[PDB]
Amino acid sequence: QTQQLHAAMADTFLEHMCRLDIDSPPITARNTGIICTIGPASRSVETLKEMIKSGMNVARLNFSHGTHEYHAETIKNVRTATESFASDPILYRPVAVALDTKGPEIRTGLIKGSGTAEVELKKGATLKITLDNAYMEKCDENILWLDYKNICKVVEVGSKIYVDDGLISLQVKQKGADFLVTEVENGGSLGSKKGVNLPGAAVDLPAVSEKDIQDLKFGVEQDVDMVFASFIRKASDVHEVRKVLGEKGKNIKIISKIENHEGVRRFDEILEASDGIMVARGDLGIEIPAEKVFLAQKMMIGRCNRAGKPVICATQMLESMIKKPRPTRAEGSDVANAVLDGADCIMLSGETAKGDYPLEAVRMQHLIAREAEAAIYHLQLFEELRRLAPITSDPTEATAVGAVEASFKCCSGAIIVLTKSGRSAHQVARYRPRAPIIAVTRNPQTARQAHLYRGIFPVLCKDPVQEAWAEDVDLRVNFAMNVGKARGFFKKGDVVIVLTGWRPGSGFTNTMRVVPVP
Amino acid sequence: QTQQLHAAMADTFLEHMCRLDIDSPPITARNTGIICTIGPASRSVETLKEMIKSGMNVARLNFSHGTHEYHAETIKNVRTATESFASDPILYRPVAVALDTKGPEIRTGLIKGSGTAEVELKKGATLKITLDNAYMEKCDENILWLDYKNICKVVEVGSKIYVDDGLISLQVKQKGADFLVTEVENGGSLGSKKGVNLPGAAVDLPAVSEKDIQDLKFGVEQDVDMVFASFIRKASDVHEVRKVLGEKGKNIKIISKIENHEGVRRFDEILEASDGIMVARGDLGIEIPAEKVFLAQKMMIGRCNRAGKPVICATQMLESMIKKPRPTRAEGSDVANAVLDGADCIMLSGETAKGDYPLEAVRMQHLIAREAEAAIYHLQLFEELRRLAPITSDPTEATAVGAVEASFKCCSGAIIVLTKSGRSAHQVARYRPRAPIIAVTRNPQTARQAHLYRGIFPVLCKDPVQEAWAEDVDLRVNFAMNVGKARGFFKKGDVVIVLTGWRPGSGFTNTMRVVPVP
Amino acid sequence: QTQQLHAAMADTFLEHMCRLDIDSPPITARNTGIICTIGPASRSVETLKEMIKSGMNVARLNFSHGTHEYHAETIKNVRTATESFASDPILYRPVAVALDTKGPEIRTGLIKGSGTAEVELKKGATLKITLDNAYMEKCDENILWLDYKNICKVVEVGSKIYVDDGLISLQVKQKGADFLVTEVENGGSLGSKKGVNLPGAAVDLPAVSEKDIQDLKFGVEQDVDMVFASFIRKASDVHEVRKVLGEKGKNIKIISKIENHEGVRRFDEILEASDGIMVARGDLGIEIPAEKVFLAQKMMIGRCNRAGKPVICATQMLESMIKKPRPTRAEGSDVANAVLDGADCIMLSGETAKGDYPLEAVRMQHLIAREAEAAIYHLQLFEELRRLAPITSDPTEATAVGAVEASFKCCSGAIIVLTKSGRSAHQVARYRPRAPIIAVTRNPQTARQAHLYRGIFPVLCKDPVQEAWAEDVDLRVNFAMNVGKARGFFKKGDVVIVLTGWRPGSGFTNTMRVVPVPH
Numbered sequence A, B: 001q002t003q004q005l006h007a008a009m010a011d012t013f014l015e016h017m018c019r020l021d022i023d024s025p026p027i028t029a030r031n032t033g034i035i036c037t038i039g040p041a042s043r044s045v046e047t048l049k050e051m052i053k054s055g056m057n058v059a060r061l062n063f064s065h066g067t068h069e070y071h072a073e074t075i076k077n078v079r080t081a082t083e084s085f086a087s088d089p090i091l092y093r094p095v096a097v098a099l100d101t102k103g104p105e106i107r108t109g110l111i112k113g114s115g116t117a118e119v120e121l122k123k124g125a126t127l128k129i130t131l132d133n134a135y136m137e138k139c140d141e142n143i144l145w146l147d148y149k150n151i152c153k154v155v156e157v158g159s160k161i162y163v164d165d166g167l168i169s170l171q172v173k174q175k176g177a178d179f180l181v182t183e184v185e186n187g188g189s190l191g192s193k194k195g196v197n198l199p200g201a202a203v204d205l206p207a208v209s210e211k212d213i214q215d216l217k218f219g220v221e222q223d224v225d226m227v228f229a230s231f232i233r234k235a236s237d238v239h240e241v242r243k244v245l246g247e248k249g250k251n252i253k254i255i256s257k258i259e260n261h262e263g264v265r266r267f268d269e270i271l272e273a274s275d276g277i278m279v280a281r282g283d284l285g286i287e288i289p290a291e292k293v294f295l296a297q298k299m300m301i302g303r304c305n306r307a308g309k310p311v312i313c314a315t316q317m318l319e320s321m322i323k324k325p326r327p328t329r330a331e332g333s334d335v336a337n338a339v340l341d342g343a344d345c346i347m348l349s350g351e352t353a354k355g356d357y358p359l360e361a362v363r364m365q366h367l368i369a370r371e372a373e374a375a376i377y378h379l380q381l382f383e384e385l386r387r388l389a390p391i392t393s394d395p396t397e398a399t400a401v402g403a404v405e406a407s408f409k410c411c412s413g414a415i416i417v418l419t420k421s422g423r424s425a426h427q428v429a430r431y432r433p434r435a436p437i438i439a440v441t442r443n444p445q446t447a448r449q450a451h452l453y454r455g456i457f458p459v460l461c462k463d464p465v466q467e468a469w470a471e472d473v474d475l476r477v478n479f480a481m482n483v484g485k486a487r488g489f490f491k492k493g494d495v496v497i498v499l500t501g502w503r504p505g506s507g508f509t510n511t512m513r514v515v516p517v518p
Numbered sequence C: 001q002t003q004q005l006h007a008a009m010a011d012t013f014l015e016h017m018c019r020l021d022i023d024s025p026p027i028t029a030r031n032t033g034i035i036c037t038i039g040p041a042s043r044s045v046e047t048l049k050e051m052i053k054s055g056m057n058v059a060r061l062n063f064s065h066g067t068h069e070y071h072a073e074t075i076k077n078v079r080t081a082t083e084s085f086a087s088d089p090i091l092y093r094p095v096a097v098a099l100d101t102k103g104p105e106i107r108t109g110l111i112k113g114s115g116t117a118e119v120e121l122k123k124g125a126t127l128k129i130t131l132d133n134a135y136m137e138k139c140d141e142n143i144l145w146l147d148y149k150n151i152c153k154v155v156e157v158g159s160k161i162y163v164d165d166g167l168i169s170l171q172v173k174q175k176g177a178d179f180l181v182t183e184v185e186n187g188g189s190l191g192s193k194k195g196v197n198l199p200g201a202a203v204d205l206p207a208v209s210e211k212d213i214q215d216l217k218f219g220v221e222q223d224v225d226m227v228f229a230s231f232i233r234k235a236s237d238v239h240e241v242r243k244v245l246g247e248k249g250k251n252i253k254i255i256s257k258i259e260n261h262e263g264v265r266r267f268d269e270i271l272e273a274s275d276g277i278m279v280a281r282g283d284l285g286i287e288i289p290a291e292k293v294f295l296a297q298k299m300m301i302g303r304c305n306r307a308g309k310p311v312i313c314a315t316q317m318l319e320s321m322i323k324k325p326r327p328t329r330a331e332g333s334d335v336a337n338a339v340l341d342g343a344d345c346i347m348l349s350g351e352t353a354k355g356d357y358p359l360e361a362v363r364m365q366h367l368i369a370r371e372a373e374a375a376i377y378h379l380q381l382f383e384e385l386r387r388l389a390p391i392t393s394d395p396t397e398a399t400a401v402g403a404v405e406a407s408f409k410c411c412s413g414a415i416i417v418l419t420k421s422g423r424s425a426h427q428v429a430r431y432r433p434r435a436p437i438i439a440v441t442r443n444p445q446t447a448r449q450a451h452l453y454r455g456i457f458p459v460l461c462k463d464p465v466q467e468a469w470a471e472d473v474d475l476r477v478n479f480a481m482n483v484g485k486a487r488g489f490f491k492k493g494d495v496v497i498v499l500t501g502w503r504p505g506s507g508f509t510n511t512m513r514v515v516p517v518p519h
Ligand SMILES: O=P(O)(O)OC[C@H]1O[C@](O)(COP(=O)(O)O)[C@@H](O)[C@@H]1O
Pocket: A418, A419, A420, A421, A422, A423, A424, A425, A472, A499, A500, A501, A502, A503, A504, A505, A506, A507, A508, A509
């Protein structure tokens, strides 16, 4: 048997686990989007073509470093590689471009006037934090300057301060006007201009920094598809990002990065305002105990799935592959479990941006994701999603859930969906069918953004609009059939589900057909 | 709220995930046993005392390397460290000793008559494998000798052969009398006496090597608690191990290591014959595609949970901690997911045997395990375990399940179980209660072996047997109460479940009491 | 297989239904209490002995008719019959006595001065209702007097008024000071002193009538175990009954009869104030549309199961057996579905009080109940009861649920429970085990009242208290063992669950043992 179908039929989750079968091969289609950070290892046109062939769906640009010029050139290269495949629309894969903001930061000053010097902090010693700029280049083991002018307003006696990616830990023992007397908990080497984290604080840094405002404007100019917004703490932060993107950027998707205690606790209001979520495990695991990160990951993925909004699992998923051609067993497991949890997309950072084996890391995420998709317990998942969802008068919703149900009953090879804005295909994806969703659109931005949703394989129709609308619809259905055949999703005579609407604009999807592949 | 109790009450798994709460702190008790491989980083008496304080429950000795003398000294050191705490019976923690066999291997010959010389294998080139001993010390890029005399009987044209840690890959193109012509698929530097793996082969090497027989004899002499038996492919392999251990070794637990396709496929018969299972992910992931490992892991943990037999998750769980003081996000996730899967125990190999941060690795497994134990969806798990279990006439079974039910109903701080052999405590653990199981025994081997089962906290009663049996029972109940109080499991006036029998001797557990903590 | 155990194991309710097996015989024990109304057909000592042997657990006296002398003699007869079995305590079955009140009523006056004369009401005709006592003996087809002085305050234009057990129906067209002009909807022969119902009205008649006060006093004097209180509309009505019973009657259980729209709507507050509930389908189906009665029945049984309070299904269960030796197929089905619903007790009224086949009716309820009990889907029911239940600090609750779980795991022949007040056994019954609950008590009133809960077989221990408490406990457990053996619930070597506490006195049940039945 294939596709873990024996497991699929189990009446209990435990039996489902007992039936997982290494000799049950997956289907060809892989539903989980792969987001790859582009950097020195992966930025040439030549490598990018291979990244695409290996499974990259979204190119992430990390604006923490690099100039506008550098990023503009990366994006140019991504598009060159992407479009090199455009001559065969059956085989072309859309590739989205995501801008990931630097975001607000807290930084220390210079040790001893140097950028490279360091000092030793001993566990239990005193360290005074000063805001007084006289000390901004005279940091030492006694006096630490940092740039967050309001720090005193947001911490209390007992508060912790983490320095240099959580390497050093301090506890506030006394608060002054413009200073904090701290005791070192975890000591270590303190260097220059290090990152500061304030675990449990309501930090009042602006939603977007001066640099972020410039970067977001540049993302609009560059026609990016989505923004990963750093350090989102509250709904109003999302609103600020949306306002910066403005009218011109109104169709760019905002993915809030949840990376501290506040963001986790205010998650509901953040999700409601956002187009989707990134579980930003790197910073999140600096801010909160590392042993608690899996809780926040499963919380966020569950609530995103409940809301029907895309969620990304990010950071260190295949970390060892920076240096090695094969992942660890914990890494394999992490990727599989993220898909099992419900993540729409999984991400690579240093693995693709700077490591020695970027192609292998992409291919590995592809292999794991496809195995894990088969191992989902759809029988329980679909039951729960359908119960948790509202009853509505919305005809498109009723059509989508009916298509998903039909797809399980006939084990279809695909659900084909015509969509202008993406929405009809998003509505199908939210019910987590096993079958891949082939979303046919003429809208290039729809095609790129659809990668955010589990299961959506976007295909970009380039044909002229036919004079007879019924023929225009049939043309697009036929395109999807050719795509699925060419990509090995299904073959002639297999059964597939087709979703269309009753007239041309958006919002009329209402027709479900069960048809043999011609 | 605490212990993820809000999530505990969700009526769906999805809602359960949505309710996981980083602000809901776990209980003190940590139920998942921690097994640590001992080596140069962890073998001193001083480090071993800290390994115990940090949470080590089982010392694993890897007989792949080291003489009898070396291993005898490790065991002596573990006992010295363990017994250094014996003077306070309230606080003493039993520590088990596990012998992990080398097991059968397939090895290549010498490159240029040298041990250190190497040759380059080009992808797509020919490589002939010979059994002809004339070439046993003349391996080169054209002719590779190996020591598996039956290899021709167990591979076909099309078969793969892996060399080193799956570094090199070969595909069989022709079979001859004494030889195999292969094509190199994955090339690389081939050195001397490297490990060979035969994916998908029924390999007919002995269940136990000549050296393994010697090592098992030594394990009996050294009073080890359990054997982790390598490369178990079939029930008869387990029977061989059991026969070697013989009458003298009849109470030593046999944990079969599942590490190839055959072991996975023959899993049921192997489980039935074994005392427990190790998911040996390292070798498993060389033999089978790495992307399929999580399937085999969940299959094995599920089936072990269904059978009520201990299962260990092993290998690369916190791999990066060999070199770093903190784990990656994928590693944190791996540990959490292993416990969520149902693993009785989790394991450390190079992280404790040879790494720079053995204590931190133990502490991290402790932290994660405890968080993940709270995050289990006991509502569904208990329902499934109860349904999957038989109706029996066995009174002790009915008592155990009644105790677990009662423990959920009153949120008890513990299930206290008097047990000679461990069996009554095992029967409770198989229903996966939230509350820790304090298993009071006078039998030191029982106490050590109990670490194999999720949730059992073994405590070794040292007081003489009291003249009146009722007083003797009460004394042990009181001891358990004092252990729980001293370890912070519960406090005066909390409620606990107490299991005893109606007369002395094993097999009469039949009495369940709900008692306030005095 | 037996006891519908193959169906018991189904993974879905649909499959459970598909597995029900006419060739799978039930166990001996029957868990659903049978309440039998005693009347001319069933009041002799001799018949009462056979009613007990046939399965009667509760004798109901209907105070709608009969003098105190008549009812006292019935009660004396029930005790004589019940005590005739007392000389073997192993075999003695407690029998409860229930007083069912007449309750407040609305009655019309006399037609044409006569008690026997009648008049014809034609659909669509006018009929004026008067409260003016000048007309109390001059009811005719134009003027109907009735005795409910506040009727005008509680009905509106559009209100329906039902007369003579809902035979006739009237619709209020105009309201005056002391009158109502109505139109006849359903016509028919109107006689004298007929019962009036006010569907949908908040009727403000007293909780207890003048006759009820007398009857309750008599119930206390006669040591009855429970009162079925008529026409309960609101919690304050229950409180009034409780207050009337007072100190002397404080241990008499009050079972509220739900018999109108208001009682159904205010059900929650009524349940909370009551010891249990009767789904009084007869009057309920006069007050509300007949086609809606199964809704109110299942609502009340489900909510009583959720609260852990006894519920009785009553009225016309085996009606045709008043005249015939066998029931209809609808009646067989009604009894089985009541037990499947979750009813603690089922009831017989004219079937036992006045019909030609009282013993056959009791026997048939016994047979059907025992078949239906096996056909319950305990797998889902136990899961739901456990989930709907709180997490509790109460150790007795933890013990009860642990015992019920253990009882399913080993298919035990019984759960034996020592109880003074009944409560420990009640706590087990509320989780609906398959196995019978043998409740051992020295308290005779506990023993009789225990019949209200599904599954409890009360046994009355008559042995002296032993000097050593341990021995005293053991003696009672042994008694239970002997009872179960003699009644064919289980045999030597079977396994049974035993519940005890850690010291004497109520409230300390905390000990669950799994024990082989001794030789
Ligand atoms: O997902 P969206 O944006 O609502 O688009 C779906 C729409 O696409 C259609 O199938 C075809 O519309 P067009 O021909 O305008 O592309 C409609 O019938 C339907 O309403």
